[model samples]
Target: IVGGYTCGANTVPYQVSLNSGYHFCGGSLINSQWVVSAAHCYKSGIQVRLGEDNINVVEGNEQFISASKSIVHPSYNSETYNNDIMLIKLKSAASLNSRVASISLPTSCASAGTQCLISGWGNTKSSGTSYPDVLKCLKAPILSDSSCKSASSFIITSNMFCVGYLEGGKDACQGDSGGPVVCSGKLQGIVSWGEGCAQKNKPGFYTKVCNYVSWIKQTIASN
Candidate 1:
């Protein structure tokens, strides 16, 4: 299983480990040169372990990259969680292979009803704790725009996307932030927020990748 639900193994190709003895989450390699992850994950003194499964157990297969520079979206406010996106420029680009490859970003916005994949090592149930080893993933259908607005009246902005089941268990929980939410094999979103990790009535929210293309391009260009 790649993200939480069962697909074939090796479906999504990237995994990020935040130091030893910590939780793992999903991340996407964009252009083999940069990593797009949540700003919250860019905490001080953290290391991004790319191309590995178990950070503690795995060794030879890992390409541990120190972040050369991190640019958090200027509008990001940790208290309010606005503009939760961030880009990490690797100290050097990794050598790409089948085990580690870049996924392309979608050129346009996804419409409501689009089915997408969400991956991470988050909690299996709404209130459960996060999974330790082995990545978890699942497929979620995008909620209708009106439905998303009704569910999250205050925070559903054009910059955000809503996904997951309304009835329950499937979602990106506590440790899944800054991970990828993909659709049609293109990077579409990054885990941003939710009412509660995997709650029944609340869907997971993401920072729409489409809204930040210009910022991402400019940032990457300048750096």
Candidate 2:
């Protein structure tokens, strides 16, 4: 139930280079000057790669954007992983084209059970290893607010959303954090957490973008 194809040239994505290597994660080109991703992905020495399909190959054609500053949600709590969202202010605005461009934010919040798309270069199978070079994507339905809260037995606050296969065969794994969870051609959520990658009854969680509209606008304005 959870499966899809890799994003094409028009789809703008973001990758965070970890100590291990680069992992393909989805991101929203909110503006030519800014991109939004998960706060957890911001580790020391970590850099962001934009406007590219191949994560391993960092040669020509792919633009490398230096992050001037990383602002994690002030209310973010690592222990419980609350408020797991952030914004990366690029040192310079990216040169735009059809393959690389900005995506619009959700005009309004979505209701429970609203379907959305999750894309990444993370593991294909639940326990399988991550993808080598090619990017992967999957379509997961939005879990009801109450259902998601009950399933996790956690706060499941308004700032977050839930998505995944109910029976569980696919999900956004370790390397897929901070990726975008899109819906109706609009930016909706940011990958955050799950009990286990693609586990049955354990849906993938994300930071609800609609809930952070003010924060995002203010952050970008201040920067």
Candidate 3:
């Protein structure tokens, strides 16, 4: 996420590298075998790398697992960013350890103005092309639906939520898609899309996880 500093290894254990022979996006381990990310981040040769700190080299504890399957939400709209969530099934279930595990999804949605944390390996600066070798993190505040709608130049559907500031600065940026938005230690939203990295008035929009609970459950149960 933009405006983030290094969080170091194991700071966010559920944070995963969406490796396409390189890190393109971020994701969170939801279960031993399932990972959740943005639908827009989907691409060929994608896999999961768990418990990694420095991504350029293979660490002893890293688990590079092939994607068994990937399911982008059927209702996902590229234009509107509606239902921008996606699920990745690993070829093999992950083995949890101190440095690796899954995060619990939120049972209820976080309310507006809740303090939350965003984690990822996205661009550190708005103009930078390089992602940090280690994970990065920063705090953000959930803006009201009305405030977000007014700030953005696009529609704010009930299926989506927004975070960041009207004055700009803190935000989830490029390469952060599919990451977690944690509030009160729960997975509340997904890093779906945004206008610019961290720009004036334009807060980042996310897929409200609570809205997809039934869909998440059904998808997991059948698969």
Best by TM-score: 3
Model 3 alpha-carbon drift over 4 Å, by segment: none
Report RMSD (Å) for each prediction in the order shown: 2.5, 2.6, 1.1
> What's the alpha carbon RMSD for model 2?
2.6
Please give each candidate's TM-score: 0.89, 0.88, 0.96
Q: Could you tell me the TM-score of candidate 2?
A: 0.88
Which residue pairs in candidate 2 have backbone atoms (N, alpha carbon, C) closer than 3 angstroms, thus clashing?
none
TM-score of 3: 0.96
Local distance difference test, per candidate? 0.73, 0.72, 0.87
Please, what are the lDDT tens digits per residue for candidate 2 over residues 1-223? 1355776543544332222245534456678878788877776444556666666765455766767777889999776667888887878888876656677888898787777878766666665564646556777788887678667755566678888776877777777777788888788998888887777787888998998889999989988
Candidates 1 and 2 compared: the better one by TM-score is 1
Give the lowest summed-lDDT range of ten residues in model 2.
12-21
Q: Arrange candidates by lDDT, descending.
A: 3, 1, 2
lDDT of 3 by residue, 1-223 (tens): 7777788878789998899878998898989999999999888668899998888877788999989899999988888888899999999999898889888988999999999889988887777686788888889889988888778777678988899877877788898889998899888889988888889889998889999888988999999
Worst lDDT run of 10 residues, candidate 1, spans 1-10
True lDDT of residue 41, candidate 1 = 69
Residue by residue across 1-223, what tens digits does model 1's lDDT show?
A: 2126643334567545555336444456786668888876666545566666554466465777766777889888676566778888778788787777788877899998899888766656654454645566788988877777677645566777888878866777777788888898888998888887656677888888988888988899989
